[PDB]
Each structure stands twice: as structure tokens, then as C-alpha cells.
Write an enzyme that holds these catalytic residues in place. Structure first.
Site, PDB file in Angstrom:
ATOM      1  N   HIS A 209      12.730  14.893 -43.266  1.00 23.60           N
ATOM      2  CA  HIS A 209      13.597  16.322 -42.855  1.00 23.60           C
ATOM      3  C   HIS A 209      12.207  17.215 -42.694  1.00 23.60           C
ATOM      4  CE1 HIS A 209      17.456  14.859 -44.925  1.00 23.60           C
ATOM      5  NE2 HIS A 209      17.858  15.498 -43.594  1.00 23.60           N
ATOM      6  N   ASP A 293      18.133   8.096 -36.836  1.00 26.07           N
ATOM      7  CA  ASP A 293      18.555   9.247 -37.628  1.00 26.07           C
ATOM      8  C   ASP A 293      18.247  10.325 -36.767  1.00 26.07           C
ATOM      9  OD1 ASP A 293      18.694  10.750 -39.871  1.00 26.07           O
ATOM     10  OD2 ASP A 293      17.048  10.023 -41.202  1.00 26.07           O
TER      11      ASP A 293
HETATM   12  C1  LIG Z   1      16.578  10.931 -44.683  1.00 28.46           C
HETATM   13  C2  LIG Z   1      18.063  11.413 -44.255  1.00 28.46           C
HETATM   14  O1  LIG Z   1      18.447  12.077 -45.244  1.00 28.46           O
HETATM   15  N1  LIG Z   1      18.485  11.502 -42.908  1.00 28.46           N
HETATM   16  C3  LIG Z   1      19.884  12.171 -42.572  1.00 28.46           C
HETATM   17  C4  LIG Z   1      19.865  13.279 -41.536  1.00 28.46           C
HETATM   18  N2  LIG Z   1      18.764  13.884 -41.459  1.00 28.46           N
HETATM   19  O2  LIG Z   1      18.597  15.050 -40.589  1.00 28.46           O
HETATM   20  C5  LIG Z   1      19.190  16.374 -40.455  1.00 28.46           C
HETATM   21  O3  LIG Z   1      20.427  16.205 -40.493  1.00 28.46           O
HETATM   22  N3  LIG Z   1      18.485  17.122 -39.662  1.00 28.46           N
HETATM   23  C6  LIG Z   1      17.525  17.868 -39.932  1.00 28.46           C
HETATM   24  C7  LIG Z   1      17.857  18.881 -41.311  1.00 28.46           C
HETATM   25  C8  LIG Z   1      16.739  19.630 -42.020  1.00 28.46           C
HETATM   26  C9  LIG Z   1      15.344  19.643 -41.688  1.00 28.46           C
HETATM   27  C10 LIG Z   1      15.014  18.566 -40.243  1.00 28.46           C
HETATM   28  C11 LIG Z   1      16.046  17.847 -39.584  1.00 28.46           C
HETATM   29  O4  LIG Z   1      20.771  13.138 -40.414  1.00 28.46           O
HETATM   30  C12 LIG Z   1      21.716  12.218 -40.202  1.00 28.46           C
HETATM   31  C13 LIG Z   1      22.834  12.758 -39.340  1.00 28.46           C
HETATM   32  O5  LIG Z   1      22.984  13.905 -39.724  1.00 28.46           O
HETATM   33  C14 LIG Z   1      22.216  11.420 -41.612  1.00 28.46           C
HETATM   34  O6  LIG Z   1      23.096  10.471 -41.412  1.00 28.46           O
HETATM   35  C15 LIG Z   1      20.846  10.958 -42.305  1.00 28.46           C
HETATM   36  O7  LIG Z   1      21.041  10.314 -43.629  1.00 28.46           O
HETATM   37 NA    NA Z   2      14.581   9.336 -41.912  1.00 25.90          NA
END
Ligand SMILES: CC(=O)N[C@H]1/C(=N/OC(=O)Nc2ccccc2)O[C@H](CO)[C@@H](O)[C@@H]1O
Ligand code: NA
Length: 617
Positions: A209, A293
Site C-alpha cells: 500500500h 492487486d
Molecule cells: C497487499 C493487499 O492487502 N492488497 C489488497 C488491496 N490493496 O489496495 C487498496 O485497496 N488501495 C490502496 C489503499 C491504501 C494505500 C495505497 C492503495 O486491494 C485489493 C482490493 O481492494 C485487495 O483485494 C488486496 O488484498
Molecule cells: Na500487493
């Protein structure tokens, strides 16, 4: 036969599509929040408006991912999903969600469940199947048809800031087992299931993230550990695999110039052809849907342009680009057109063969067919669908189930001289110590309920929230007046200050409140001979911060009680155990590394005590 007919059907449907419609299917945006004409900034989208409907019709996305913001109530969720399927012009949307259970849930009124690591602690692969089955039933009633679950990352780096209790185990077989059965549980309810995060995010100490993690292990370790639960579930019928924005130079040591500082960075697996086509698609034999992702994450967005990320993923072999651009009003809608146009330019030049687009879209259509998304099966009214879903989602029977799993997952790591259970005399004073207000509220509520129900004698209760606090005389005074003390410890990465095996208890501020404060409370209860129990609430590794305690449990989940609702079942389940009202059956799904003696394990994987006898289960 049905598989043979389904492949021919997807081919016919895709052959009849325009390049625009095909590229649309390959995009899965979110509309978490939206700023409708006249509004001043993006609000939670809980009802469909004609603006969002118009981009769905314009761009014909293959699906939408929902977040908590979009699914706060069962009534509102059934209406949003009906309405979304109403906007999609030709092909029913994949409506997906992160209903992982435990610490990652979205459904406002649904069943939250203890979470994967609590499932690992409970061991039995049928419980993962029952969790996947109940989630699948709730999503179905709601009209959501895809779940980005299970996480089958193996959490063998205890400093993992993003996976932690979202993993079943540090052990490949336990994870694989519970992973396969969660998947089967979901697929059994017609919910498409995604394994994540491939090729395995469980060893990272960076959160993708927030930046780009590196896994530097060789192929031999990567195949035997990280890949293992993926291969088993892929063979078993996995519908989809989600990628990980993480670098694996053993697999692909291709580098790119970081948009951020011009530096050379190893490619993230999401954007590597070697990993997504060579390894996943070909060696591993996965012919289901590869989904990125979220491409809004900084592991990607820091170092790659917006359009450029989407193009690089598809080139790498993914079928669906997840959250390609955040558009929050009609004025930003050209972000989508720009991703579509970049892909077109890539097809035109031949950097992405149009045949690749065809195979990708076929996969997507075929999953929508396989899982009964298309044709749309249901011919009930929205009103009827809302009545029905109201009886299924968060149902009493479902709560009974969550209650049972959460209680079994409770792992007791110490109980000397039958410190547990607490059997309080009337009018005892019970001090509840936890980092945040909702956690102390959860423990208080469970206790109040226990009194209401005549399970325990009447006690008075007091709270102490210690996040960002320094242990002061006012606090020790409370510990001194207490008859019983229950303390919740919260860590993600366990980082107490420790010098030559001695945890530094001299720190007189509150930068290290998460380790220093609860240890302070312990030392005062132990000095004053107070019954004292430490309940680890997130990652279990903080168990090493309390070797002095006579009683100590882990519950694998930290969310407490707000707005009249329990946001997880784990804290109440540990409170039941503490007061004798539940039988924990949990054993560690991971090793707990010693803090006082670096390099040694303190509690082995599979260690857990019988709360009554004190003998390992
Ligand atoms: C590593 C992980 O937790 N990725 C998740 C995930 N990570 O990205 C975010 O949701 N967006 C984001 C939130 C805070 C900082 C940067 C991108 O998104 C996918 C869909 O929502 C989940 O299915 C994934 O498990
Ligand atoms: Na990831």
C-alpha cells in the site's frame, strides 16, 4: 462437456464484441466515493446515481469492486447491486469485495468471523470451508458474486505489516489446507474466489500500500514455500488469482526507471511477464482469471504512470486491471478513456496482440458463465431480494457459527496455578486495560452481558485506554484498587526496546506505548499480587513481551465494539474464556520468536494449553 460448451460459448460471445467492449471487460474500477454534480467533494456511494450509471454504460466495465462505504446496510447493498447490473449494458458485472473475514471485512451488517489466523489456530479445514460457505451465502443474497479471498500468503516474516493475521499460518500445509477449503466453500455458493497475493506476499516487511516490497529468496525456497498453497488450489479448481505488487528477482530481475526518482527498480510481479505468463499461466498451469492487486497502491503508482501500469500488467498476462484509476466525479471520467486509449495503442502497434485480449476476455466471460453470473439467474423483485437477504445476512445461525469458531481459535499460552478462569466474588473491581476505546468497550460489553446472563457474580468495571499514553501514578493507582486486571496488547510489527535480553522498562514517554505501557500495567499487578491476564489482540508475537505474566492468551483479532455492534468476535471470545464460559481449543499457527533471547522460539508452532488442566492440547 459442460466445460467444453462453456468454452465455445465464451468464444462466440467475445467474437461478437468490439475492441472497446473487450477492453472494458478487462477493467474493474471502484466507485467507493462520488461527488455528484453540485456536491462539494466525494461522498460514500451507497445509492446508484445517473452519473456513475453513465460511465458503466459508456465504458462497459467488466466489474466493480465494492468497499465498506458502498455496503453499509443489507437493504442498501441489495439495491446498489441490482442497480449496478441494471446499468451494465450487455454483460453482467462481476461485483467483487474483500470479505476475507476477521480483520478485513466490508459488509455492514454481515458476519465478520475471527479471521484466517484464528482459523489456522483452530486447525480444522472444515471450519475454513464453513467460513467460506457462510460468507458465500451472505454475498449471494446481496448480489455480490466475487470475493477476493482467500489470502494464501504464508506469514513467515513476523514483521509483515500488511498480511499478519490475514494469513492462516507460517506453515505451507496449514495455509494450503485452509486456503483450499475456504475457496471450495465460496465456489460452492457460486461466488468466484480469488487466491492472493501471487506469487506470495507473506515474507515482506514492507506494505505494498505504501511502497514496493522485495522478496530476495531463491526459486527453490520460493517453490517449496510461497508457491505451495497456490499450486494446490490452482490444481483444485481456483477461479482467479490476485497478483502482488512485490519484487522477486529470483523470478524476474528486469528493472525499470522509477517515475519517482529516476532510479532502477526491479519490476513488481504484477508487471512481470516472467511471473504472470511464464510461471503462473504456464508452469503452474493456471488458466483462470489473473487480476491485479489495486493499481492505486504506492508500490505501483509511485514508480509507474497510470495508463502505463495498466498497459504493463496486461502485457505481463493479467486479464483484469483492478482499480486502474480513481474517478470520483464526472470531471475526471477521461482518466478511463485514457487507459482505454493507451491499451488500444498497444493493440494497434501489436505490443499486445489482439488475440491476447480475446483470450483474456474469454476467460472473464467463462468465469461469469461458470459461476452463474451470465445469464443473470434471478428474476425476483428488488423488494423481494431485500426481504430475503435481510433474513440471511448476519443471521442468528450465522452468528452462532462465528461464535463457535472464534471461541475455538482462542489460544492459551500461559495459565500458571489456575489463574484462569477468573471466578470473581460479588462486588469485585475489574480493571479493563486496552489500547483504544472500542476495545475496552468490547470487553466491558461482554462482561456486562455475562452479568446480565447470571454467568458471573456482579462486578463493577473500569476502563483504561492506553494508546499514546505514558504510565503515570494515576494508572498504577487504578491497578492497585483493582481485584482483577485484563490487559489487551496490540502490535503489528513487534518492536519493544530491548538491550541485552532486557526489555527496557525505563522509557518515560509514550513513543513506545504499545509495549512499554502494557508491560508497566503488568509489573504493577504482579507487584501487588493482582490476578492478571494478557490477551494479545492482533499479531500474536507480542506474547514475547510478557514472560512475567502468569496468564496469557492470543485471540488473533483486534476490532472491538462501536455503535452497538461487535466489529469482530475475537475479543468477546477471549473474554468468555477468561471468565470460564468457553473452551479454547487453539494452538499456535506460527512460531513466536523470543524477545529476551534473540534467535530462540518462545512458543513453538502448535503449542497451546487446555485452559482447565494446563496441559498442551
Ligand atoms: C497487499 C493487499 O492487502 N492488497 C489488497 C488491496 N490493496 O489496495 C487498496 O485497496 N488501495 C490502496 C489503499 C491504501 C494505500 C495505497 C492503495 O486491494 C485489493 C482490493 O481492494 C485487495 O483485494 C488486496 O488484498
Ligand atoms: Na500487493
Amino acid at each position: 462437456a459442460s466445460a467444453s460448451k462453456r468454452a465455445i460459448d465464451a468464444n462466440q460471445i467475445v467474437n461478437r464484441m468490439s475492441l472497446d467492449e473487450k477492453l472494458g471487460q478487462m477493467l474493474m474500477p471502484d466507485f467507493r466515493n462520488w461527488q455528484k454534480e453540485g456536491e462539494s467533494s466525494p461522498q460514500a456511494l451507497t445509492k446508484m446515481n445517473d452519473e456513475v450509471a453513465s460511465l458503466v454504460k459508456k465504458y462497459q466495465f467488466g466489474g466493480i469492486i465494492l468497499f465498506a462505504e458502498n455496503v453499509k446496510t443489507t437493504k442498501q447493498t441489495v439495491q446498489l447491486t441490482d442497480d449496478y447490473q441494471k446499468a451494465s449494458p450487455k454483460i453482467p458485472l462481476m461485483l467483487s469485495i474483500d470479505q476475507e473475514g476477521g480483520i478485513v471485512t466490508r459488509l455492514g451488517e454481515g458476519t465478520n468471523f475471527p479471521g484466517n489466523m484464528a482459523l489456522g489456530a483452530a486447525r480444522s479445514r472444515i471450519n475454513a470451508y464453513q467460513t467460506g460457505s457462510i460468507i458465500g451465502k451472505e454475498l449471494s443474497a446481496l448480489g455480490i458474486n466475487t470475493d477476493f479471498s482467500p489470502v494464501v500468503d504464508i506469514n513467515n516474516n513476523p514483521d509483515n505489516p500488511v498480511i499478519g493475521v490475514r494469513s492462516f499460518s507460517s506453515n505451507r500445509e496449514l495455509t494450503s489446507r485452509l486456503g483450499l477449503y475456504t475457496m471450495k466453500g465460496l465456489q460452492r455458493q457460486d461466488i468466484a474466489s480469488a487466491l492472493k497475493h501471487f506469487p506470495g506476499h507473506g515474507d515482506t516487511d514492507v506494505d505494498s500500500h505504501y511502497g514496493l516490497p522485495l522478496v530476495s529468496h531463491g526459486q527453490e525456497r520460493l517453490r517449496e514455500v510461497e508457491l505451495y498453497p497456490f499450486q494446490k488450489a490452482i490444481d483444485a479448481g481456483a477461479d482467479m488469482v490476485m497478483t502482488a505488487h512485490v519484487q522477486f528477482p529470483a523470478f524476474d530481475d528486469t528493472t525499470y526507471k522509477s517515475k519517482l526518482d529516476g532510479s532502477d527498480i526491479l519490476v513488481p510481479a504484477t508487471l512481470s511477464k516472467k511471473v504472470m505468463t511464464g510461471l503462473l499461466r504456464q508452469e503452474m498451469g493456471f488458466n483462470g482469471v489473473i487480476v491485479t492487486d489495486a493499481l492505486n497502491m504506492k508500490a505501483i503508482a509511485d514508480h509507474f504512470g497510470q495508463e502505463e501500469a495498466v498497459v504493463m500488467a496486461v502485457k505481463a498476462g493479467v486479464d483484469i486491471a483492478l482499480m486502474p484509476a480513481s474517478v470520483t466525479s464526472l470531471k475526471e471520467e477521461q482518466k478511463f478513456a485514457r487507459v482505454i486509449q493507451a491499451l488500444k495503442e498497444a493493440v494497434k502497434n501489436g505490443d499486445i496482440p489482439e488475440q491476447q485480449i480475446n483470450n483474456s476476455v474469454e476467460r472473464i466471460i467463462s468465469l461469469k458463465i461458470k459461476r452463474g453470473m451470465y445469464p443473470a439467474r434471478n428474476s425476483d423483485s428488488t423488494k423481494e431480494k431485500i426481504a430475503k437477504a435481510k433474513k440471511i445476512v448476519g443471521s442468528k445461525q450465522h452468528l452462532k457459527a462465528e461464535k463457535k469458531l472464534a471461541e475455538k481459535a482462542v489460544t492459551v499460552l500461559k495459565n500458571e496455578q489456575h489463574t484462569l478462569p477468573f471466578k470473581p466474588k460479588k462486588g469485585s473491581r475489574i480493571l479493563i486495560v486496552a489500547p483504544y476505546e472500542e476495545q475496552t468497550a468490547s470487553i466491558e460489553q461482554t462482561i456486562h452481558d455475562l452479568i446480565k446472563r447470571k454467568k458471573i457474580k456482579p462486578v463493577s468495571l473500569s476502563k483504561m485506554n492506553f494508546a499514546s499514553q505514558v504510565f503515570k501514578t494515576e494508572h498504577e493507582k487504578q491497578v492497585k484498587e483493582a481485584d482483577y486486571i485484563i490487559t489487551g496488547s496490540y502490535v503489528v510489527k513487534n518492536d519493544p526496546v530491548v538491550n541485552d535480553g532486557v526489555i527496557d522498562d525505563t522509557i518515560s514517554d509514550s513513543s513506545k506505548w504499545a509495549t512499554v505501557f502494557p508491560r508497566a500495567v503488568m509489573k504493577a499487578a504482579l507487584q501487588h499480587n493482582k490476578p492478571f491476564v494478557l490477551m494479545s489482540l492482533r499479531n500474536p508475537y507480542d506474547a514475547a513481551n510478557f514472560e512475567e505474566a502468569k496468564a496469557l492468551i492470543a485471540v488473533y483479532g483486534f476490532k472491538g465494539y462501536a455503535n452497538g455492534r461487535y466489529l469482530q468476535p475475537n475479543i468477546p471470545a477471549g473474554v468468555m474464556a477468561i471468565f470460564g464460559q468457553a473452551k479454547p481449543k487453539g494452538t499456535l499457527p506460527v512460531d513466536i520468536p523470543s524477545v529476551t533471547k534473540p534467535g530462540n522460539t518462545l512458543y513453538p508452532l502448535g503449542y497451546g494449553l487446555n485452559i482447565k488442566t494446563g496441559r498442551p492440547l
